[PDB]
Design a protein around this ligand. Structure first.
Ligand SMILES: CCCCCC(=O)O
Ligand SMILES: [Fe+3]
Ligand SMILES: [Fe+3]
Length: 221
C-alpha cells in the first residue's frame, strides 16, 4: 500500500532520503566534471552527463518542496563522505579506472536501484520526476561500461582493488538507508537485489567472467 505522504512519520524519513538523492546528484555532477580533468578529450560528453545530474538534482529538490519537507543536507553529506573521500583520493592520484568504478558503476547502480524501488511507492508528483531520471542513469552506466570495457586489459587489477575498497561502502550505505527507506515503503531486499543486478550486468559488459564477478560481489562481505 502507498504511504501517507502527508504524515509526520513520512515527512521525517523523506527529509533524509530526499537529501541523500539530492546530494548524490550533486556529487555525480561534480564527479563527472572531475573525470574530465583525467580525460580531457572526453570533456564535452562528461559536461553533458554532469548537466543531466543537475537536472535530476533540481527535480528531486522539487519533490521535497512538493511534500513540504526540508532536506537534511548535513545528514546526506555525511552519508556520502566515505565514498566521496575515496573518489577524491583516486582523483588526486590520477586513477581514472577507480574514479569511473566509483561513480559510473557503483553510484549509478545504487541510484538505479533506488529509483526503480522508489517509483512504485512514490507520490504522483515525484513519480513523474523519477520516471524521467532512470533512463538517464542507464546512459551514465553505459558510459562507464564503455570506457572500462575499452581499457580493461590495462586496469583489471586496479578495478579489483577499487571494488574491494568501495563495494563494502555501498553495502554500508544500503544498511544505513534501510530504516528510512522502509518508512517510504521500500524493501531493503529489493534495493540490494536491484543494485547487484545492475552492477553484475555492468561488470559482465566490461568483460569480467562469472568467477571474477562472483569474487567481486563477495567483497561486500
Ligand atoms: C541515489 C543517489 C545517487 C545519485 C547519483 C547519480 O545520479 O548518479
Ligand atoms: Fe543522476
Ligand atoms: Fe547518474
Amino acid at each position: 500500500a502507498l504511504p501517507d505522504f502527508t504524515s509526520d512519520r513520512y515527512k521525517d524519513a523523506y527529509s533524509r532520503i530526499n537529501a541523500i538523492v539530492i546530494e548524490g546528484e550533486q556529487e555525480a555532477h561534480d564527479n563527472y566534471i572531475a573525470i574530465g580533468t583525467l580525460l580531457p578529450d572526453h570533456v564535452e560528453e562528461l559536461k553533458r552527463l554532469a548537466k543531466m545530474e543537475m537536472r535530476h538534482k533540481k527535480g528531486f529538490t522539487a519533490c521535497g518542496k512538493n511534500l513540504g519537507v526540508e532536506a537534511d543536507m548535513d545528514f546526506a553529506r555525511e552519508f556520502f563522505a566515505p565514498l566521496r573521500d575515496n573518489f577524491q583520493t583516486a582523483l588526486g592520484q590520477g586513477k581514472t579506472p577507480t574514479c569511473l568504478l566509483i561513480q559510473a558503476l557503483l553510484i549509478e547502480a545504487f541510484a538505479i536501484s533506488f529509483y526503480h524501488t522508489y517509483i512504485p511507492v512514490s507520490d504522483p508528483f515525484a513519480r513523474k520526476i523519477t520516471e524521467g531520471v532512470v533512463k538517464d542513469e542507464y546512459t551514465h552506466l553505459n558510459y562507464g561500461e564503455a570506457w572500462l570495457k575499452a581499457n580493461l586489459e590495462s586496469c583489471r587489477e586496479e578495478l579489483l582493488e577499487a571494488n574491494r575498497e568501495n563495494l563494502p561502502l555501498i553495502r554500508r550505505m544500503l544498511d544505513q538507508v534501510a530504516g528510512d527507506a522502509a518508512v517510504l515503503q521500500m524493501d531493503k531486499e529489493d534495493l540490494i537485489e536491484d543494485f547487484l543486478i545492475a552492477y553484475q550486468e555492468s561488470l559482465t559488459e566490461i568483460g569480467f567472467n562469472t568467477r571474477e564477478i562472483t569474487r567481486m560481489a563477495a567483497a561486500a562481505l
